Amino acid sequence: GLPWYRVHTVVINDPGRLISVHLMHTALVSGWAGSMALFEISVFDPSDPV
Amino acid sequence: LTFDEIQGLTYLQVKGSGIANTCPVLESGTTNLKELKAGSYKLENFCIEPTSFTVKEESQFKGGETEFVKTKLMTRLTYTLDAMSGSFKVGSDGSAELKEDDGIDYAATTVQLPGGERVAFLFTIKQFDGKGTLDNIKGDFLVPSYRGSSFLDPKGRGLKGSAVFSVAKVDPVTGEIAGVFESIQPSDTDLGAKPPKDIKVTGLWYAQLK
Ligand code: CLA
Ligand code: CLA
Ligand code: CLA
Ligand code: CLA
Ligand SMILES: CC1=C(/C=C/C(C)=C/C=C/C(C)=C/C=C/C=C(C)/C=C/C=C(C)/C=C/C2=C(C)CCCC2(C)C)C(C)(C)CCC1
């Protein structure tokens, strides 16, 4: 029965699943990048750069 | 094409290519300014091509000076006022007195701005009187009404611009006159709800004396 703070220790010894969670982390970071870019475009005002 | 080169075609050949939205191109007739006799002539097919629609963007990005901005057309090939006529005197030294009374003198077109903003405007040369000598044939026209007074607003309720001609090529025999054209007119307003915008139109033209 694992504690809650060591539940990612089941992929110490499973390298394909390690690559899977590397990929999922990369996808989440890129998703933040795209969503923050679109939100910042929609908020942004180019009306006077002076 | 020229005028007879256009009228040699049939309607099945004109239909579907955009040749109909053109002035007929005039041949070599440059600088024939002494080859102009007098008379109270009329015009046969006074057509005017536009080639660039620029809008005075009133928004500032540099200082208190605003230029004209090249834009895109929006509807389709919906320009080149056709079949205009009236009364067209040629005087002594080249004083043209050109009076427009009839014909399709109006065309309503829409045009963006970079920034994603649409502006509708008329292109009207209704009732123009140009009395000048072959360089700045000046005078004013009417911008009658962008929409009729019987127009329904979406919830069921409810001027003069500048125009400068020029003359470049003159056919001495048949009187075919080409030239360049400029104009500045206001935009549409929805009756004071939106302030108007200045619009410059440049182009060419064509006419046949008779
Ligand atoms: C590069 C970053 C990184 C990586 C890959 C790891 C990886 C790991 N850590 Mg770890 N750790 C890190 C940074 C990192 N750590 C930091 C900075 C600290 C100090 C705060 C710790 C403190 C720490 C402890 C004390 C322990 C681990 C443990 C572990 C292992 C299992 C994790 C687990 O199941 O916990 C699962 C944990 C959770 C499900 C809790 C997540 C809830 C968080 C707090 C809120 C959400 C955060 C939110 C999304 C914002 C984060 C985004 C960004 C700002 C980072 C695993 C190998 C465990 C270990 O050694 O194995 C026995 C362990 O006991 N880590
Ligand atoms: C020469 C072969 C090769 C190449 C090119 C890579 C490249 C990479 N490895 Mg990798 N690796 C290799 C051999 C290789 N490794 C070997 C021999 C092993 C041991 C068996 C591993 C074990 C390993 C682990 C355990 C992990 C990596 C990870 C990564 C990535 C880290 C950076 C990243 O995510 O960029 C971001 C990536 C992109 C922006 C995508 C760019 C496009 C790429 C090239 C893929 C395009 C499709 C491609 C043809 C599919 C095959 C992928 C790969 C096998 C070539 C990176 C793409 C980490 C990972 O999974 O990252 C997610 C990770 O945790 N590697
Ligand atoms: C430099 C780049 C970098 C690094 C090294 C990390 C590192 C980490 N990220 Mg991460 N992330 C990044 C950039 C980065 N991030 C970016 C740019 C984004 C997009 C916004 C994310 C979005 C993201 C998500 C959505 C998730 C992670 C998670 C994780 C953790 C996975 C390891 C783990 O489970 O161990 C165990 C990790 C810990 C015990 C974390 C302790 C350290 C953190 C920093 C605690 C501080 C948080 C703070 C108290 C506020 C709480 C947040 C809460 C209110 C939401 C690890 C700490 C995952 C996670 O939380 O792990 C389950 C997760 O789900 N990240
Ligand atoms: C296809 C590849 C690709 C490309 C071309 C881009 C391009 C871009 N990304 Mg991006 N991104 C990608 C993949 C890609 N990304 C992936 C896979 C992720 C997920 C991890 C992200 C996550 C991401 C985020 C979260 C953000 C961007 C942003 C950006 C933009 C600005 C980049 C910037 O300032 O970073 C500057 C980059 C650096 C300073 C690089 C730091 C790397 C350090 C220095 C490496 C140090 C260690 C290294 C191993 C060196 C040791 C070896 C040594 C011997 C040489 C740019 C358009 C930003 C943006 O505009 O917002 C949307 C932004 O915020 N990206
Ligand atoms: C599948 C697919 C698709 C779709 C995609 C998508 C749409 C995705 C998603 C995307 C997204 C949309 C993502 C998202 C992202 C975001 C995130 C991931 C976030 C994060 C955050 C964080 C992490 C934070 C934390 C915290 C708080 C809460 C606040 C403060 C700060 C802190 C740090 C504390 C496509 C189309 C391509 C097609 C193909 C298929």
mmCIF file with all atom_site columns, C-alpha atoms in Angstrom, chain A residues 46-47 49, chain B residues 60-62:
data_model
loop_
_atom_site.group_PDB
_atom_site.id
_atom_site.type_symbol
_atom_site.label_atom_id
_atom_site.label_alt_id
_atom_site.label_comp_id
_atom_site.label_asym_id
_atom_site.label_entity_id
_atom_site.label_seq_id
_atom_site.pdbx_PDB_ins_code
_atom_site.Cartn_x
_atom_site.Cartn_y
_atom_site.Cartn_z
_atom_site.occupancy
_atom_site.B_iso_or_equiv
_atom_site.pdbx_formal_charge
_atom_site.auth_seq_id
_atom_site.auth_comp_id
_atom_site.auth_asym_id
_atom_site.auth_atom_id
_atom_site.pdbx_PDB_model_num
ATOM 1 C CA . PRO A 1 46 ? -1.960 47.277 -30.251 1.00 0.00 ? 46 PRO A CA 1
ATOM 2 C CA . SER A 1 47 ? -3.607 50.698 -30.355 1.00 0.00 ? 47 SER A CA 1
ATOM 3 C CA . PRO A 1 49 ? 2.903  51.461 -28.891 1.00 0.00 ? 49 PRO A CA 1
ATOM 4 C CA . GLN B 2 60 ? -2.521 57.224 -34.987 1.00 0.00 ? 60 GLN B CA 1
ATOM 5 C CA . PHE B 2 61 ? 0.635  55.136 -34.799 1.00 0.00 ? 61 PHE B CA 1
ATOM 6 C CA . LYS B 2 62 ? 3.375  57.693 -35.621 1.00 0.00 ? 62 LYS B CA 1
#
